[PDB]
Amino acid sequence: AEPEHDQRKRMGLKMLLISALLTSLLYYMKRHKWSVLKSRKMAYRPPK
Amino acid sequence: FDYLHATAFQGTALARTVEGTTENIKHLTRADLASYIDTHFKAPRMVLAAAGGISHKELVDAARQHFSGVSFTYKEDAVPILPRCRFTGSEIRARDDALPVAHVALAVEGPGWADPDNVVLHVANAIIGRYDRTFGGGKHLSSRLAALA
Numbered sequence A: 001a002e003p004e005h006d007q008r009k010r011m012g013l014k015m016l017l018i019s020a021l022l023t024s025l026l027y028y029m030k031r032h033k034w035s036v037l038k039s040r041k042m043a044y045r046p047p048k
Numbered sequence B: 001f002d003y004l005h006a007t008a009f010q011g012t013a014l015a016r017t018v019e020g021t022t023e024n025i026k027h028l029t030r031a032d033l034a035s036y037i038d039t040h041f042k043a044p045r046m047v048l049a050a051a052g053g054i055s056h057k058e059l060v061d062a063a064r065q066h067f068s069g070v071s072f073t074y075k076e077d078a079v080p081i082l083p084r085c086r087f088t089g090s091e092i093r094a095r096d097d098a099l100p101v102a103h104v105a106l107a108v109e110g111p112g113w114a115d116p117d118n119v120v121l122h123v124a125n126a127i128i129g130r131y132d133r134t135f136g137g138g139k140h141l142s143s144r145l146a147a148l149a
């Protein structure tokens, strides 16, 4: 009912590893850029 | 430019305005001004310079006579070295949409007097140069940026 079976799972393996590795890398890169806005500090200094 | 330093060298000595704070000027005491002159206005750190129709020798004489500093210890004769200033890639945005025009300044850390590269850097700065509303040159100025401008 499904000859692929074996290959389908070998792929699923490769998928998890790359998926693991990649989600990580990109999570950093996303935080990296955003830091500029995350750390950002603002103050309201109306004139007197 | 103050704001530029203020953030470019943030956290250090260079990040301060020359005029100083408001609280300082409101409270600075006779003592401090005195102590400032005392600690900083010292012979080894001064330089009497002059140019025009004058005799180097006569000048040096007048000096020996009125610039009569007395140095006993090594302290007095030493020229202090200042604690380094850290450059920080950052920004400071002071917004007020009510002002007529906007001012923007962008910079990278420079080498400092000593380095020979300063020459090249000035040559570089000449290629880009500067411009402003009243230059007659106009669309023909050699500075690419001035043209586009």
Ligand SMILES: CCCCCCCCO[C@@H]1O[C@H](CO)[C@@H](O)[C@H](O)[C@H]1O
Residues within 6 Å of the ligand: A007, A010, A011, A014, A015, A018, A019
């Ligand atoms: C974002 C996740 C991407 C996962 C990419 C995995 C690529 C699948 O890799 C596949 O593996 C099979 C068996 O090893 C081979 O027979 C296929 O030719 C190969 O393309």
